[PDB]
């Protein structure tokens, strides 16, 4: 009998892309790219602002991208919680799936929903766990290269180079390694030109940017010693740098002078170190695995504003770099133990602990002198110190209740330091209807633990009105310690007939989203003393939204119309996503997403590809930061559109194989307009808040032993 977790990575909402389909789908840089192909997954920002809204990130069944736990080897990363938390849900990172680079990636796991929750922390959505290239019995090794040259010369070209090596030291010993260097070019600044929303008054010239670029540098070891034939113990060490290439990205698109002199400049840097020490057994009566983890994060970058307008954007008078530091620390043991009297049954027994140390001298420096002092704030000096610590302890078990019915209960107990204890319960049935339908259900309480900077006090935003709900007046946005961890009932119902390479489903989820945290509605407290009009201003906290909603469809169809020749469709359609206390939606999502890939092995050492996806409507948010109905342009919406592809890979030995394809065939096109509300002197942009990239044509090699 499989283990509880191996077994759920057969339910409907689980996805795997196998290194043969990143050859076959070949991403610029991030991995994102390929990995929002599967059914249930966007790419998406984390609310409806339209902030950094060319840095979109992975999101799971409309559940937003801080749902999404992304590991790497079945351990967790977390550096992009290094970087600030905005007013409205957003920060200035580009995700966490950069850190792996593509060529050196075994398969990547996606787990949705219900059979995701048993990962813990930040698996609401779900889980994608990126699987490295691994030794085996021989020295074996590649270098994989790419590179793409777009029509349109604003839009940012990628050059990406790595290898790996890996194979035996002594008979009882292997290593692994890989390095990889990667830049993907920024876009011009003026790319956006023409399509920016209208631009008044002194923000006149002002313009939302492209995407940001990035400089990689990917360094690993590992290396594996057999202690005997039932332990194995791994010692490995990750060096990750990016830098960016900055291009006018600021949150609301207002510009300075700061902004302007740092085009072209690296403005962040992230350094990731990790070290790990992993114990694996396989024993008599079961197997085995403890590991620890420690992740510091250095994310270094130029000090922005905290007030208003003024969030988020290059301040002259503080002029520099400063770093926040991430220390993230994971330890994890489980025992895996088949019991064969009653059922045949596989019991999972296991605990968890994390820290995270977040250390972050310039978020938390936001005065109080303007709109008045806050009771038990001071308004200097403040800490720049956070942390939480998880416990956690576990059982699942998968049980035979007869041949083709398997039934999988878990529970999971998890207790914060700050935050309490959180009970998640889960689970997931797969029967057999007949040798080619199968049936399968879920249903599982996930949990999210506020993040650091929803939970500090000490963290402190400030608008004259503009961004404060339900007046004009100045406001102050706080932390707030006495929130609740956010929770999700994520169901889903699912079937499939799977035949001869003949595959067609259809799942259905529903996620009932309780206490989802968002900035608050209604004012607290107020402030007193201060400045003029700006007196006394109200104090607003973090707050837990008490429900919300999300649903939609899961399908896949895979036929295979003749021997060499596979046509694949995901698709993916959003029936809900709501705020229930504002009516607002939670996430902006395409209506649907489809995404069809034609395969012909037209020769043994040839095969051609064809890519369309299909997205659909996109519509804003209705209401903008003081609760009104949005105005004008800010209403627009995307229509739906496609983007086809064309690629190939030609094998000119086993050895050897080119790589050559066109993404976006029709030179289909989108611009950043701004963000999808209005502001003073700057029109909303509604749903028009990323850069589409045009046709773009790509070549690569891959060289292996
Ligand atoms: C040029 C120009 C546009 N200028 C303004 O809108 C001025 C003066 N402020 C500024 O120009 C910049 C830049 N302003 C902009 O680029 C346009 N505003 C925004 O994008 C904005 C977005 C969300 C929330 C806000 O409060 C915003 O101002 N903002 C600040 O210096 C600022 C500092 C502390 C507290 C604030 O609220 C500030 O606005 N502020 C106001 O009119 C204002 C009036 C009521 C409420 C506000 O929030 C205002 O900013
Ligand atoms: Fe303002």
Redesign the pocket.
Known sequence: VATAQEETKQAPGVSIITAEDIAKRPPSNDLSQIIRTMPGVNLTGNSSSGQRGNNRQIDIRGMGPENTLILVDGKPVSSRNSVRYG?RGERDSRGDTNWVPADQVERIEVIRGPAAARYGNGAAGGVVNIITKQAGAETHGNLSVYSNFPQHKAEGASERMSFGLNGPLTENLSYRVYGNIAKTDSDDWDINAGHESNRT???AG?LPAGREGVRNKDIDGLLSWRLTPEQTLEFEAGFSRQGNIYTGDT????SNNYVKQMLGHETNRMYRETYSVTHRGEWDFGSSLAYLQYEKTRNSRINE?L?????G?FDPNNAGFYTATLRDLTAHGEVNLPLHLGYEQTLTLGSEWTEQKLDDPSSNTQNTE?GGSIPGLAGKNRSSSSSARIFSLFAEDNIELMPGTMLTPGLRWDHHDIVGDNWSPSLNLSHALTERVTLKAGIARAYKAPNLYQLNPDYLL???????YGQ?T?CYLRGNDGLKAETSVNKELGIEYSHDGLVAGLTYFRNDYKNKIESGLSPVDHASGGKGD?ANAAIYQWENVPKAVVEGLEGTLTLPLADGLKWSNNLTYMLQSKNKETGDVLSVTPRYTLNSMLDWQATDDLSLQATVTWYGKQKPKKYD?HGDRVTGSANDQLSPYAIAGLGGTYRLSKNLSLGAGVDNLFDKRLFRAGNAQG????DGAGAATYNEPGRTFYTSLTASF
């Open positions: 007013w008054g002194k923000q002002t949150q609301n698109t207002n504003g007030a208003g307008g003024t969030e954007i303007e400030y608008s004259r009105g503009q961004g404060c004009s100045s700006y930061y502001v003073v002197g700057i």
